[PDB]
From a paper:
To further test if in general a hydrophobic interaction is indeed beneficial to high affinity c-di-GMP binding or if this effect is lysine specific, we created the K167L PilF159-302 variant and characterized its c-di-GMP–binding affinity. Remarkably, the ITC measurement with PilF159-302 K167L yielded an even lower KD value of 2 ± 0.3 nM than WT-PilF159-302 showing that the large hydrophobic side chain L167 might improve c-di-GMP binding of PilF159-302 even further. Thus, we crystallized the PilF159-302 K167L variant, which yielded crystals diffracting to 1.9 Å with the protein chain being traceable from residue 161 to 301 with no Ramachandran plot outliers. The L167 leucine side chain is well resolved and in a similar conformation in both chains of the asymmetric unit and involved in an extensive hydrophobic stacking interaction with the c-di-GMP guanine base. Moreover, a large hydrophobic residue at the very first position of the c-di-GMP–binding motif is apparently thermodynamically and dynamically beneficial for very high affinity c-di-GMP binding.
The traffic ATPase PilF from Thermus thermophilus is important for type IV pilus biogenesis, twitching motility, surface attachment, and natural DNA-uptake and contains three consecutive homologous GPSII domains. The N-terminal part of PilF harbors a remarkable arrangement of three successive general secretory pathway II (GSPII) domains (GSPII-A to GSPII-C) with high sequence similarity to each other. Interestingly, we find that PilF binds only two molecules of c-di-GMP with different affinities and that the c-di-GMP–binding activities can be attributed to the GSPII-B and GSPII-C domains. Remarkably, the GSPII-B domain binds c-di-GMP with a KD of only 6 nM and thus with an affinity ∼ 83fold higher than MshEN.
Residue numbers in the entry:
A (entry chain B), B (entry chain A): 161 to 301
The structure:
Amino acid sequence: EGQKDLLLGELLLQKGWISREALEEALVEQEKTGDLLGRILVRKGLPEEALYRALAEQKGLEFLESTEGIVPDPSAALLLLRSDALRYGAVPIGFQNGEVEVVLSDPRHKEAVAQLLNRPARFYLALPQAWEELFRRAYPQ
Amino acid sequence: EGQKDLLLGELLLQKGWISREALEEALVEQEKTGDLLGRILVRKGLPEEALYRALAEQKGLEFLESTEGIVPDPSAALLLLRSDALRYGAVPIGFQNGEVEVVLSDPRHKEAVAQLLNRPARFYLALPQAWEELFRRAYPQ
Ligand SMILES: Nc1nc2c(ncn2[C@@H]2O[C@@H]3COP(=O)(O)O[C@H]4[C@@H](O)[C@H](n5cnc6c(=O)[nH]c(N)nc65)O[C@@H]4COP(=O)(O)O[C@H]3[C@H]2O)c(=O)[nH]1
Ligand SMILES: Nc1nc2c(ncn2[C@@H]2O[C@@H]3COP(=O)(O)O[C@H]4[C@@H](O)[C@H](n5cnc6c(=O)[nH]c(N)nc65)O[C@@H]4COP(=O)(O)O[C@H]3[C@H]2O)c(=O)[nH]1
């Protein structure tokens, strides 16, 4: 679990998705634009799925390649108001071994959601459009 | 599209997923061994998904991150015998606009499968694990 102590750029370098010169160029650009590093690398050719798998490794989330098969448990969605699910980007979908399963849209929100839910939870990560489709399934109307 | 005219090394270089030095070493080893180039590159640290994304662009295939969302259509599976689907590494999964949708395990087989099917087809490419999971669902023993 040593990947949780790595910077994003280092994780992608170790995997081989970017070169050291591309990373330095990206950090140089960031110093003047303020954009997130991952957004710059994606614009420069990194697949968004590769970006999210690295961010999932960094924060201890399970990346979901697909949300199409999930049937959200209504009892789990009760654990967050719809307005909170939207604002925190978090969808409770079910339960495993006394933990609530929660699908995040942004790995940076893991800590704020965990503190709020205040109970054992297992966190997943989904790309924006898969997250949005799951959210409407779980929190209709 | 003009991507179909490029060598694999050229495609990886233009996408920024391989260095010129790493490609040259792999091509020199291949002169000595005859191994498939992408096999040498992945062994030297190229992400397998980078290899498959490049090979998909080269053969005009859509790369599939996951097959877990696919519900294989039984009538499409009739278009190949199970033994053929396995030998050719091809799973017919459905139909769209009068084309059969077919998920391949190896882009080098696209031409052999297309001639056999002998009808309009749209081809996809999936990583080995995702392919095998789809095949087992489409063609139970
Ligand atoms: N939803 C989303 N989240 C993203 C994205 N990119 C990064 N995140 C995460 O947001 C945190 C802050 O990203 P940053 O603003 O680019 O701020 C970065 C960045 O300025 C820099 N950095 C990242 N990687 C490297 C590296 O390899 N070497 C060096 N010298 N600095 C790095 O260190 C700071 C902290 O990096 P991290 O620990 O990895 O923490 C990162 C990462 O967890 C994105 O595109 N989308
Ligand atoms: N499923 C799968 N398919 C793979 C893999 N590696 C290559 N393929 C594909 O198989 C064809 C033959 O690969 P090769 O024997 O290594 O034979 C290659 C290789 O010897 C060489 N080559 C590839 N890229 C370059 C390059 O950038 N520069 C130079 N000078 N030669 C290259 O030219 C030949 C033609 O390569 P391509 O037109 O790209 O056609 C390649 C590519 O379509 C793999 O690991 N898995």
